[PDB]
Amino acid sequence: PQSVSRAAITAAYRRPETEAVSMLLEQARLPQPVAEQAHKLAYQLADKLRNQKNASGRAGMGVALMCLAEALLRIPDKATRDALIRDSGEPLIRKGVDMAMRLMGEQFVTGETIAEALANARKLEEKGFRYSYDMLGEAALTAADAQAYMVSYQQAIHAIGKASNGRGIYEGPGISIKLSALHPRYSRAQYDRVMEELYPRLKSLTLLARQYDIGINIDAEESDRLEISLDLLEKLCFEPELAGWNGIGFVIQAYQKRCPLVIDYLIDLATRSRRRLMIRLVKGAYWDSEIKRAQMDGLEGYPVYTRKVYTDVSYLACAKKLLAVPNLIYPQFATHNAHTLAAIYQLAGQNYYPGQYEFQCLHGMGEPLYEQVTGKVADGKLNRPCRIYAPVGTHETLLAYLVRRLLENGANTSFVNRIADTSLPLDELVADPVTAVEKLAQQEGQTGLPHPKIPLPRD
Ligand SMILES: Cc1cc2nc3c(=O)[nH]c(=O)nc-3n(C[C@H](O)[C@H](O)[C@H](O)COP(=O)(O)OP(=O)(O)OC[C@H]3O[C@@H](n4cnc5c(N)ncnc54)[C@H](O)[C@@H]3O)c2cc1C
Ligand SMILES: O=C(O)[C@@H]1CCCO1
């Protein structure tokens, strides 16, 4: 027997999308006036982003001719110019792969060593950005692997905490950790061994973060690990040494059917354990693998949505739920999507205060968007804080994170991919996801039908 809130998470695991999407719709819908201010802000943010160095206005203004025009413009004297016009198998494939990973991946890495990352934190921190550092590495395969991740996480907390120098959990830097790094073969670990071995290391790192008064966030990974992550979180929140401290962070993934039910659980947990939880709301990073995984499991359905617009709707519904309980949750709204950002900005209401919520972004992806957001109003900014997720490590820790980035940047449904498309008009790019879903429902006959190219695992 689970609590009321836990049982309800379980019962939502793979509920039919028509049902899941239908229940989210009214929770996600922006009231008329909020919708229009969100549309307008989303449009302005996306316009500035696209047309940074006049990229579209130069579209408005063949190549052969320009080279001749170029050569003609290098003729120093206009008269002369005018007068001229009048009158090896396995290891070769492995090497190209390892190299291309480094080349493409550098943009997403803040530094090789935590010091190096930290020494460069001054530039954006003075502009009002914050940081969450991640010592790259995950999915420990051996007892030794996990031990080494544990020591890298401990070392980072010391350096981050010393650099935080008492600025605290909101204004100061934090750390992000992956539970998969701390226990060998996490992907298949049983409740009993995780509690005996993983939990004491999570507890120990969290106590340390509390000594330095820095935030410590537990990243969300694959969906089959949600339940055990909640058991770990629960225990952690009742530690006496952590009483009255609100630095514990936890990620929730809006692409999951369970997400809203996990929120109901977290609200009850913050209440029972007498704390404000730092909760990062994301869409999620593992969608391609989740789809593949469920298709091989052959179960009743998917634990994630199959159309990107449904995830967008789920995120807005979940964002409203989070924003309603400021005594219990500090929401951290992770996104690079201008509509998403604008919707959250408006949904948060009037009378922003720094401790109400922040935005978050990944290093190498969100800086352009958030250069319009974080900063003074007199500089034309929104004056909302943003916390940059800063991966730290060498080439041997980068692979899995990089692949997730390529999937995110390379998917035609991604905002960061669609905004680069000269040809997709701004209004479509920032279209309201609820209205989009209702448009599909009127075309197709029912609300929340799965992606037509993604049938159920049994079909
Ligand atoms: C600071 C930060 C921290 C993050 N931490 C985590 C974390 O701990 N764990 C984690 O899993 N993710 C995490 N993410 C989220 C993930 O890494 C992506 O960055 C995020 O999902 C992209 O959302 P968006 O709003 O920027 O882009 P959008 O383009 O609006 O949405 C992109 C996405 O929608 C979802 N999607 C794509 N196609 C479909 C489809 N067909 N059906 C349903 N959904 C689809 C995927 O989640 C994909 O990322 C984090 C993101 C940030 C910025
Ligand atoms: O690892 C990832 O891909 C996501 C983004 C940062 C934390 O979890």
From Swiss-Prot:
- Map out region (Proline dehydrogenase) in residue numbers: 88-423
Q: What induces it?
A: By proline, autorepression and catabolite repression, and is potentially nitrogen controlled.
Q: Which family does it belong to?
A: In the N-terminal section; belongs to the proline dehydrogenase family.
**What do we know about how this protein assembles, alone or with others?**
Homodimer.
What is the stated purpose of this protein? Oxidizes proline to glutamate for use as a carbon and nitrogen source and also function as a transcriptional repressor of the put operon.
Q: What is this protein called?
A: Bifunctional protein PutA
Q: What is the protein's species of origin?
A: Escherichia coli (strain K12)
